[PDB]
Amino acid sequence: SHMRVAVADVGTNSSHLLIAEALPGDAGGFRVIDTLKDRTRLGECLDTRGELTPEGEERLASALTRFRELAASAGAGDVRVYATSALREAPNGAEVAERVRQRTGLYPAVISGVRAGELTYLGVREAVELGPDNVLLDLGGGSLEFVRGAEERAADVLSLPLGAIRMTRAFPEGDGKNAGRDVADAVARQVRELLRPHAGRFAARPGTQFFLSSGTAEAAADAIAQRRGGRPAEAAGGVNGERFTLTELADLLAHVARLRPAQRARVPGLERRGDTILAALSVLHAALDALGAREVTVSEGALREGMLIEELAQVQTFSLALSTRQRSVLATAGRFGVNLSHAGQVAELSRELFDRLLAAGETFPPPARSLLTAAAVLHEAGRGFGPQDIELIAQIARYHRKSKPSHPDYVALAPADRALVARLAGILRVADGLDRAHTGLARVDDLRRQGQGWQLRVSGVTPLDLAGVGEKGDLWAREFGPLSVQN
Ligand SMILES: [Mg+2]
């Protein structure tokens, strides 16, 4: 058997789960085992102050509980969860995310709109045939990402607050005859307003291919196909790779705008989106029209597929850079069943902290880097190394302030090895906190001596990661002096 992995995203409208298995060949690919979508509709559970309600917290917990059960059922174990920037509230995101972590075990890490767009672009890459020059729009309930790239990754990302829920709420629809058309016009003016300053970066040139993802675009492609006399997206197994034109979109929108909100849910393809679909289609049409697009291709791949790709990419990049002996450690860790993505991130952070400390004058014995790397890989387990090295690794990997010296089989290392274990376990614990949310995103920017202590600048950290460093950096402060974490 190979490695089963689980990723999940929490957006404004829905939550998504991907369970997959890595491909043999350390190539970066995967095989899809199962997928799940939960219509969490958190954008409907925001209060007057932009915070998520307890009902919205309940819906979130149910989604992560279903997600975590399916993943454990497949052998996936840990589920990395990213949330878009609006789903978890304007000021209380940290509190909401800690709460669901306590209730379910999974921690929804808020990422930026830019990072969401980059990852979504990778999922699109996994689904469709990108060219040398691609513009992707990803419309959700909260934001719209514009992304331009070539055949492998995003080069430029813009994130605008033009989500289908947000636009539906911002232009309440009247009860008159042209009420739909008026909502669509006003939404179209909001789109141009926010897009005009940066439209050039995403405008059509000869050969530009436009792509659309997420559920609005998927519902639109279905509806347009059935307008050309097609069958529900059941036939043809979905809408992946389907194409449609700006004109067809406009006609769909004209039809939807003439209909009453109730009647839109009886338009074939729109059956599940009647409440937002008018605003959402005005956003797509108005944004594409501003960019000069004439035809699009719809993609069923999106954020969750890009999450899997980035995770496997970080895993195998670390694996390839490792030595023969260290790769054997990673393989052994996998056999025990540890999260290799978490192992690799903690090893990389450990190595980064270790190297900064060396550059700052901290002395370490030659095998120190090698012992820390191996203990980092094995730190969550419930060949080519000497028996002393293995014992050091073991103690680094399983360090706790409370040993009992007199109890039989107590392992008392020589004073120099005692001191080494304590310093390397202090690094390891800080690195472990920096990936406490299991995002793979933390990075060490700088590590400077702050008097008799140190100052550590980090990026890509969630509130849970910073709190973890404060709880686990106690050993570091004892060995290296007080530690302040910033950014
Ligand atoms: Mg850990």
Numbering used by the authors: -1 to 380, 402 to 422, 425 to 508
Question: What does the study report here?
Answer:
On the other side of the polyP binding tunnel, E114 interacted with both P5 and a conserved positively charged residue R86 which was located at ɑ‐helix 1 (ɑ1). We also determined the crystal structure of the E114A mutant of DrPPX. In the structure of the E114A mutant, the ɑ‐helix 1 adopted a shifted loop conformation, and the E114A mutant lost most of its enzymatic activity, suggesting that the interaction between E114 and R86 might be crucial for the catalytic function of DrPPX. Moreover, crystal structures of PPXs exhibited that three conserved residues (E114, D136, and E143 in DrPPX) interacted with a water molecule, which is consistent with the molecular dynamics simulation results. Mutations of these amino acids into Ala also lead to a decrease in enzymatic activity.
Degradation of polyP into phosphate is involved in phosphorus cycling, and exopolyphosphatase (PPX) is the key enzyme for polyP degradation in bacteria. The PPX hydrolyzes and releases the Pi progressively from the linear polyP chain. Bacterial PPXs share conserved catalytic domains 1 and 2 belonging to the catalytic N‐domain, and most members of the PPX family contain two additional domains 3 and 4 in the C‐terminal. The exopolyphosphatase belongs to the ASKHA (Acetate and Sugar Kinases, Hsp70, Actin) superfamily protein, which utilizes a common fold for binding and catalyzing hydrolysis of ATP phosphoanhydride.
